[PDB]
């Protein structure tokens, strides 16, 4: 069949805030396909505990490609409305006016992220992934599809 993923969302409006329909147990995949517009300075994928804006939902994993100068990906965590220490990845595959596929795999102690079929970064858990029930996608990005593979 054409469906290889679960709970697929097509062509969402950005900003997108959606409930993740099952638990992010080890081996679970979040697959996001899209493209970067020509004027993009940044976009982000936020794995959140809820969708509240007061207090702002904890962001277990903020995955934030940035496009100025040489480009990078910034990752961080928001706990009780405060950012932690940034982790910057300098070898970034994202480019303005290009399409991409992000695959986030949840492991026991970290996330692993591949982009366009290549391992890109790790991010150690700072909030237990059991607290994550919401997917936010924000900023200057066009999303074609979101899908899941729940373990």
Ligand X SMILES: CC(=O)N[C@H]1[C@H](O[C@H]2[C@@H](O)[C@@H](CO)O[C@@H](O[C@H]3[C@H](O)[C@@H](O)[C@H](O)O[C@@H]3CO)[C@@H]2O)O[C@H](CO)[C@@H](O[C@@H]2O[C@H](CO)[C@H](O)[C@H](O)[C@H]2O)[C@@H]1O[C@@H]1O[C@@H](C)[C@@H](O)[C@@H](O)[C@@H]1O
Binding residues for a carbohydrate: 66, 76, 86
The partner in contact with residue 10, picked from ligand X, Cl ion, none with C-beta cut-offs of 5 to 8 angstroms by kind, is none
The partner in contact with residue 109, picked from ligand X, Cl ion, none with C-beta cut-offs of 5 to 8 angstroms by kind, is Cl ion
Please report how close the Cβ of residue 83 comes to ligand X at its closest, in angstroms. Answer: 5
Pick between residue 74 and residue 107 the one whose CB is nearest to Cl ion. 107
CA torsion 129-135-137-138 (nearest 10°) is: -80
Q: How buried is residue 145: exposed, middle or buried, by Cβ count under 10 Å (0-12/13-18/19+)? A: middle
By CB under 5 A, tell whether 84 contacts Cl ion. no
Pick between residue 54 and residue 108 the one whose CB is nearest to ligand X. 54
Encoded tokens for 132: 């994550």
Of 125, 123, 136, 131, residue with least CA distance to 49: 131
Angstrom distance (rounded) from CA 96 to CA 83: 27
Q: How buried is residue 78: exposed, middle or buried, by Cβ count under 10 Å (0-12/13-18/19+)? A: buried
* Residue in 2, 13, 53, 70 binding ligand X, rule: CB under 6 A: 53
Q: Can you give the binding site for ligand X, defined by CB under 6 A?
A: 15, 44, 46, 53, 56, 62, 64, 74, 76, 83, 86, 138-139
Q: Can you give the binding site for Cl ion, defined by CB under 5 A?
A: 15, 107-110, 138
């Amino acid at each position: 069949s054409l469906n290889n993923l679960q709970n697929i969302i097509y062509n969402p409006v950005i900003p997108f805030v959606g409930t993740i329909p099952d638990q992010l147990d080890p081996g679970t995949l979040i697959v996001i396909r899209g493209h970067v517009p020509s004027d993009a300075d940044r976009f982000q994928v936020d794995l959140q505990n809820g969708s509240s804006v007061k207090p702002r939902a904890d962001v277990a994993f903020h995955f934030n490609p940035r496009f100025k100068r040489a480009g990078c990906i910034v990752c961080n965590t928001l706990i009780n409305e405060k950012w932690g220490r940034e982790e910057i990845t300098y070898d970034t595959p994202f480019k303005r006016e290009k399409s991409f596929e992000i695959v986030i795999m949840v492991l026991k102690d970290k996330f692993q992220v591949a982009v366009n079929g290549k391992h890109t970064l790790l991010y150690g858990h700072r909030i237990g992934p059991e607290k994550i029930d919401t997917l936010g996608i924000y900023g200057k990005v066009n999303i074609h599809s979101i899908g899941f593979s729940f373990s």
